[PDB]
């Protein structure tokens, strides 16, 4: 018939597709490249700027901008290029024909929603749309109405507790630690072993090292004693030019900074202790159920061992008599999209859309009262 688009801006990856699909079919990094060198050959078809996987391929000659930093859109002209690329090139669909559903992290500036709506209605002429909290969608994605969602992608981390479909807006926590800043730390520890990555093209190489080789130690201090006292832990990786690099304690040491942000220099406690401090802000009747369901979402939660490390130290913080249960499906990297896929295909949701009439009547302010 007609089917809602569902789009997640994330940071790093964009992932997009149609409502009721099983998984997104547009997936590509939300990255905008411009050529920085002097162009010599006359007539090779050089563009002004490349987007997504095209910029990943040519990135040798490009500066790469990420237009979203910590879930805030910092650069709007380059964001419009990414949406334009998603609808026209990647999904090949005319945006007037389809309601769109868009995803955002909580506790971020309201100008971000005013602008994102103004652009959706006025340039695309999208007939109706909605903006949904990323954490909320992970429960739809996992078949629950109760839990505390710990969600971290690139950029923002946030915890949102939900008890039978009621949010608890006073107990929401947000942290800026996740995903990119892990990489910007890993470059400095690799520099300590005498490899130096100085440019945005090299950053993507480090990000792939992180994705292949990093893992979370169950006990950080014993494993640093192990790596210091042994070779066994040390693993070797091949750069795109066929050089080979060897990485020992650095590989576990990098995702450890999720649990001890002091390494990068933040004040706040790690994700375990903002999770616990989130649950403590909820009234005593429900903690029994929030401890019974903890849902991990987004790709920065996919380091091996992170689920165990969470369950172990929360079982250290919590009262001694309770199930602490961490629920981390292997699908979790896509959960916020799968949850939006479900939400957009409900029937009850069809009243919820902001429709173009109501924006014409009331202007971008309407988003705040209709949307969460």
């Amino acid at each position: 018939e007609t089917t809602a688009l569902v789009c997640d801006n994330g940071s790093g990856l964009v992932k997009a597709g149609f409502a009721g699909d099983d998984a997104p079919r547009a997936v590509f990094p939300s990255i905008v490249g411009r050529p920085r060198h002097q162009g010599v050959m006359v007539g090779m078809g050089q563009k002004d700027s490349y987007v997504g996987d095209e910029a990943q391929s040519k990135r040798g000659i490009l500066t790469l901008k990420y237009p979203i930093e910590h879930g805030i859109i910092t650069n709007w002209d380059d964001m419009e290029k990414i949406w334009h690329h998603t609808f026209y090139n990647e999904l090949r669909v005319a945006p007037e024909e389809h309601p769109t559903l868009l995803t955002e992290a909580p506790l971020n500036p309201k100008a971000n929603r005013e602008k994102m709506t103004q652009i959706m209605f006025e340039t695309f002429n999208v007939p109706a749309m909605y903006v949904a909290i990323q954490a909320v969608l992970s429960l739809y994605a996992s078949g629950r109405t109760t839990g505390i969602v710990l969600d971290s992608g690139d950029g923002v981390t946030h915890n949102v507790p939900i008890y039978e479909g009621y949010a608890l807006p006073h107990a929401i926590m947000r942290l800026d630690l996740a995903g990119r800043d892990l990489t910007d730390y890993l470059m400095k520890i690799l520099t300590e072993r005498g490899y130096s990555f100085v440019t945005t093209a090299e950053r993507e190489i480090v990000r792939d090292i992180k994705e292949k080789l990093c893992y979370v130690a169950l006990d950080f201090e014993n494993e640093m004693a192990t790596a210091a006292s042994s070779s066994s832990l040390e693993k070797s990786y091949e750069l795109p030019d066929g050089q080979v690099i060897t990485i020992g304690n650095e590989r576990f040491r990098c995702p450890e900074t999720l649990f001890q942000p002091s390494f990068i220099g933040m004040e706040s406690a790690g994700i375990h202790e903002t999770t616990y401090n989130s649950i403590m802000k909820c009234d005593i009747d429900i903690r029994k159920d929030l401890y019974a369901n903890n849902v991990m979402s987004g790709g920065t939660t996919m380091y091996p061992g992170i689920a165990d490390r969470m369950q172990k130290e929360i079982t250290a913080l919590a009262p001694s008599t309770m199930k602490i249960k961490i629920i981390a499906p292997p699908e979790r990297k896509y959960s916020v999209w799968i949850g939006g896929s479900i939400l957009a295909s409900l029937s009850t949701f069809q009243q919820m859309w902001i429709t173009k009439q109501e924006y014409d009547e009331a202007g971008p302010s309407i988003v705040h009262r209709k949307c969460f």
Binding site: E69, H70, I72, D176
Partner: peptide, 7 residues
């Protein structure tokens, strides 16, 4: 952001 941070 606009204040307490670079974005």
């Amino acid at each position: 952001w606009x204040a307490x941070c670079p974005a």
